[PDB]
Design a binder for these strands. Sequence first.
RNA 1: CCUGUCAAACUCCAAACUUACAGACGCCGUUUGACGCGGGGAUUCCGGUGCGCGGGGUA
RNA 2: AGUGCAAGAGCAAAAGAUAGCUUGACAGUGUUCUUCCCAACGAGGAACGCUGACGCGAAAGCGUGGUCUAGCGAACCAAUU
RNA 3: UUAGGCGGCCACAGCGGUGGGGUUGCCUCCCGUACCCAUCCCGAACACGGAAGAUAAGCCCACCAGCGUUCCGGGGAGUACUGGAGUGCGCGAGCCUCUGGGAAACCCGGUUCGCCGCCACC
Lengths: 156, 95, 186, 140, 154
Amino acid sequence: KPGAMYRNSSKPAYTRREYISGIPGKKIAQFDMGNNGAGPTYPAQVELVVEKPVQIRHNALEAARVAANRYVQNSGAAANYKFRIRKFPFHVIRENKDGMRAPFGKPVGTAARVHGANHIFIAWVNPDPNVEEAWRRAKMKVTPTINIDSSPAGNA
Amino acid sequence: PSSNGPLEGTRGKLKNKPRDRGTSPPQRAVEEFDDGEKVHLKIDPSVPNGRFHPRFDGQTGTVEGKQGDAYKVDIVDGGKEKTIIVTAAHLRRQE
Amino acid sequence: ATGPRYKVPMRRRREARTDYHQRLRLLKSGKPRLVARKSNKHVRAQLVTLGPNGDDTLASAHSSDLAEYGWEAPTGNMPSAYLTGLLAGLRAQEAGVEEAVLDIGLNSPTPGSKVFAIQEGAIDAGLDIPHNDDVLADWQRTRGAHIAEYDEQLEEPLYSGDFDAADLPEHFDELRETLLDGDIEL
Amino acid sequence: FHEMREPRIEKVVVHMGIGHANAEDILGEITGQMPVRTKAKRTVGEFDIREGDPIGAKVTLRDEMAEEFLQTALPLAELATSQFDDTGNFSFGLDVTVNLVRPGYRVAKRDKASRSIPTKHRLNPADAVAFIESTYDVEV
Amino acid sequence: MHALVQLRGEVNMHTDIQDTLEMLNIHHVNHCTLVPETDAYRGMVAKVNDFVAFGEPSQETLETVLATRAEPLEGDADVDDEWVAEHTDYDDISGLAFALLSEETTLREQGLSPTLRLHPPRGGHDGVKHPVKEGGQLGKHDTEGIDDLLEAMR
RNA sequence: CCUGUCAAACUCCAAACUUACAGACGCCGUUUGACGCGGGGAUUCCGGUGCGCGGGGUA
RNA sequence: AGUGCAAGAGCAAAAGAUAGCUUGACAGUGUUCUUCCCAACGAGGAACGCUGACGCGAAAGCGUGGUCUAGCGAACCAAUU
RNA sequence: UUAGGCGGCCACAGCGGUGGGGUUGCCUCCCGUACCCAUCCCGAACACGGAAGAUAAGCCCACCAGCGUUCCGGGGAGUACUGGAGUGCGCGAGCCUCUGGGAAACCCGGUUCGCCGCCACC
Ligand SMILES: [Cl-]
Ligand SMILES: [Cl-]
Ligand SMILES: [Mg+2]
Ligand SMILES: [Mg+2]
Ligand SMILES: [Mg+2]
Ligand SMILES: [Mg+2]
Ligand SMILES: [Mg+2]
Ligand SMILES: [Mg+2]
Ligand SMILES: [Mg+2]
Ligand SMILES: [Mg+2]
Ligand SMILES: [Mg+2]
Ligand code: NA
Ligand code: NA
Ligand code: NA
Ligand code: NA
Ligand code: NA
Ligand code: NA
């Protein structure tokens, strides 16, 4: 199903699992990538900033993350960098799959609400921004237009 | 409303903030008012008795006599005149 | 104490001095309270009214200022209590006080107790108080007879020096007698 | 300072936690005063489902009644250390517990203006061993 | 003391807003009234802020408008110096004007209609879709700003 | 200890705002009688749209 | 924690627990709120009185069933006091 | 208030900790069971009777801010949100301007280790 159906944040927040059952598991494999044994002790820190509040289905998160980290293997399986996707798909999403009668939908998935300007991804690298490229591919699989922002890095 | 009992939608107004929790001070439950005095109506979550219908929380009426220990306060609901039976525990002097 | 949500009892409840549930019931009468309190050595009686910023004591009597009238005996006993009650009751009457309800604070409603003796005294002073006669001591014990007889089992003075060796419930009468007419501060 | 800081025995509780009694009799003679029933709480598999139900007795002894008892109880015990309370108490044995504390304890047991005893004025395990050990026996 | 001029009509304007203008004696577009600068009056003009033009006028301007558009509580009578002198506490328009500006009296108190029924602005105003800071004609004005409007509606 | 996130049916907090009563100004009423009381006669109980706030629904 | 049962709320020298005692889960009749915001409408419900008779308590006092909001039924007819 | 009793507000008063104080006004701990009364067992408690001793508890007095709380300065922030208005912008979601209001977290520095009433009293 298309993102057109769930990308807007027009519905109430719907996250209380105590009143919602049958919620599909998340497809996001990991949130901490790279050298998670080490702490952000890197010279450069780039972030992928979403430019519009939107809802991102766990579907897009997984494809976006994979496409970025799977690529960050321009550095190697045990390369020196750490990748972090800071958002989690809390918002439960429904579908009315009778016509408009008793239409309250049934749980079909989850998504994460991101507000314009928040960073969804944060990578930590030594002067070796292959990460900038890992993100051109990441914001390629999420709804919004995005800003690739670099923070600690006056090594231009 | 999914139901129409007196306490429908009273979760907030009939609940104490955690610190005001517990038996209330007796001083205000024994306060004496005179006919003509203006009193603010506000149920004390901690005091079970002498209450009035939650819809009147916030009203400011006029004491006009009493019944037993309870007071008879006159208020105006919208445009209708009504008499409320309420104890001191739930009343406060205006001004 | 632990956090923002923590509930700290009212000060007088912390101090374990005021029973607020009993207090409310007491204040219901709308009458002044006859506050009967004890100490290891003394017995106090106050007639308290309600006030805007706290209680108002309109009349009181302490077992110590009992000597001020000729008391030469200990002050932590039955005869002492009664008299202190009568004394406070009289001052009460002078103050224009006619009725009161007995507040025994955290003490126990034990029959023949000193608080009830205090109550008996205040009543005899003229104060109208809701009471129950067969919960009070039998006059003799109030007089201090139980102690005189206790000294009969002497062999050694019950009173270290003090006054008398065989004690005096008679000293009691002399005093009550005194309080019942004229004299200052009454 | 001292005299009002030196330990003393406040009650010795001798109780027989049976599971359903005839045992009181021996407690009465071993101590010298009537035993008290021991009701239990909660329903459980040891065919002990009954809430209110006699399941043992106890006896709280005070003053001489407590000494005159310990003057034979202690001798029948060896243990010491580790087996002591953090408040200076200890239980050995049929159980025999000894509650120890200092002079101003009534402050926490009375009705009016009661108050909890300050940690400083509390009795430590050590200050306890001393008192007792200094009374017909040895520690550890 | 501020000069109030309604520049936007009643159709579609909140009722509680319209009643306010009415309590300020303005019942038509281009009608003006003078209002003391008090807390009570300030709140009223703030509520009406989007359908009106207001500001403190200069002595002169007030005089021109008073002369040109002032009326008796009843009737056609022109409010000129003589009228002012033979009917008010002051001796001439200037005197009245000054008193109004120094909020010492009011048009009613001196037997005058509380409303100055102005003329459409000669040359047109700056528009009723934007405030002054945006080039429009709504909201608080400069003394020079109010004067221009008032004078164009003289 | 450090570190990454949330809530229509969470709240240590907390607006704008809505609201009871009172005073003040305004406006209104005392020949245009207000506020209110009593009585006669209805029509009406398919509504719609814009804007703000919504709940449902891919729409 | 517990407080019979949804959910939310109330409660600690208690509204919870234990013990003991007691039958106010009483008769009669009202005021008021609710049912039905505003704003008319019955049954039902509640709050708060009074009259009478009682229970407990030293006493103030508490008890108009269960801490509060669900657990209810017209006329005609029958039986019953 | 050289120590008390009844309270009002009910943490600015809580939690924790330091120092000081009593031939006496005193309060306590304390000593003790013939009585009134009392423990489903214990004068522990409750109740009664009393001073040999003590200031170690409590309590009163002086003080400490580490935790919790109250209020304030500066920063966050005139940010977030928002009542009124717009032929302002944007495919749209939504945003912006004018006008009237205006926060929370958190950080840094102060405050807070109760205040007040009646009575009694070297
Ligand atoms: Cl009501
Ligand atoms: Cl006492
Ligand atoms: Mg709500
Ligand atoms: Mg005219
Ligand atoms: Mg032209
Ligand atoms: Mg134009
Ligand atoms: Mg609302
Ligand atoms: Mg009830
Ligand atoms: Mg039929
Ligand atoms: Mg039948
Ligand atoms: Mg000391
Ligand atoms: Na169907
Ligand atoms: Na995109
Ligand atoms: Na309370
Ligand atoms: Na009814
Ligand atoms: Na038994
Ligand atoms: Na001391």
